UniProtKB/Swiss-Prot annotation, chain A:
Pfam families given in the database record: dCMP_cyt_deam_1 (PF00383), dCMP_cyt_deam_2 (PF08211)
PANTHER family: CYTIDINE DEAMINASE (PTHR11644:SF2)
Name listed for the protein in its UniProt record: Cytidine deaminase 1
Organism placement in taxonomy: Eukaryota, Viridiplantae, Streptophyta, Embryophyta, Tracheophyta
GO cellular component terms given for this protein: cytosol; mitochondrion
Amino acid sequence: SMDKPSFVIQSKEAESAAKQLGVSVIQLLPSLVKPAQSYARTPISKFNVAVVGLGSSGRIFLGVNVEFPNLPLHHSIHAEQFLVTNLTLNGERHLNFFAVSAAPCGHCRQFLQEIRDAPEIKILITDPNNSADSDSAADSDGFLRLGSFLPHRFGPDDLLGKDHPLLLESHDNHLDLKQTALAAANRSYAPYSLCPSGVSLVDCDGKVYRGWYMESAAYNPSMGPVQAALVDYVANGGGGGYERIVGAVLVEKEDAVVRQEHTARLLLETISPKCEFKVFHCYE
Amino acid sequence: PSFVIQSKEAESAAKQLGVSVIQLLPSLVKPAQSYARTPISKFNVAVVGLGSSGRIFLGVNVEFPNLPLHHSIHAEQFLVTNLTLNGERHLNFFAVSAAPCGHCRQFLQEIRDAPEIKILITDPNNSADSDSAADSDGFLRLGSFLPHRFGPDDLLGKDHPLLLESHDNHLKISADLKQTALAAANRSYAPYSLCPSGVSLVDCDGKVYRGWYMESAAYNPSMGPVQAALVDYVANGGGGGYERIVGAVLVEKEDAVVRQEHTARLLLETISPKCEFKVFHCYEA
């Protein structure tokens, strides 16, 4: 019962599996890391990184790194970012623990700062070559809180004063293949630059997907709207990259500050030639 | 205000004040913030660093108001590009206006002995100082800023760093524009994906520029080839015109692994309508 795990594991199925092994639900995380590495679509690096996290609801979420060949590296999505997107799409309110296959890069540790109480997030690293589990401030299970991984951070408070996180009910008000990409943009997260984005995708078997746009205090570690929609295809989907068809809406103000129009098409046309146009017209 | 202060001019200024060059660094952070082209954030971040040669380098963050945020270049990355173009071998100290993001702390891991780099933060609201591992001057080594890192050693074994003399061999298939972009790709740093890149730029008065490609163990914190040439414009330039004329680039022979061709033009055509073609010609792969 340790092969081919689901990308989202229900609370009843998780605590039961831990009870038969005699371990805790927290202690079950590193046992789910190794099999999840097979899901890694890494054409470039051939380096499989998986991360399995636990929320406050009790549900177990999975995160996996994906890469895009023939594109610049900043189009690639790390495992840590995948986990955040995965639980956000399922409406998970909190993230407390996660076991990762390898030491999280600074790019991801900076990205995690968008979550409330981010430094309190305990982290365990599976990589035997890494020795974070043996730190002087480590847990009794080897977990180490994110605050120790990224001390003296550059958080959202450095640009804003008293704001809402990304995992909360981000629902800004603004106004059928395109009708689904509207509700995706409503759940976007861009408090630094006021440019939300929502991306929906269809399948050859008629599966509806979604993606939005979540910003970080540091600009570069931003999760692309298209990229956040491709995670809804690999997980809970068929698993195909040259089978993308539909495009989606971009809520720019006359293409104001953060244009993702041309970058979306450039990305899709390289991974799937049979792409469609986009509509960059939305207000409020 | 100058982007590069010579060792003879730096050590002299410190000798006349009777102080050390190290304690002289944080005074240059504040005025350097004015160079920040930040149309989006309106948040000026400057960083002044000191190398092993004794020369003082400056780093400043730049933003692009018509591109996605992952095209923007932070102050720390600017500093790295700046000293590599001047052939600085090592980086020991730098005082930064604000707490360096994880994106930059991960990017700095490409330098040999990166964790030993002591860091001072000017921002009084930040509490990097008084750390359990803080210096007697308030400096904190980068290793404490990004502990238990994901370094190059996780993907490589016994290799050359980023600050060393990286010299990969590549040949080809406005005559002094492609000849300069050839030697630029030769000084590139891409040991993870074997795709070097060199970008040259011209001026209205005919000034030849250059830009590397420096890769990171983590993919996203990658320094773009065009961006690393754009830092050669902000520094050692007029300060600053986005109305210049493209230009050059050297990518792989028929787009091997990491194609940046179409993305390069996409960046340039938005900031400067007067763009040029690209050269996908490199050998000895």
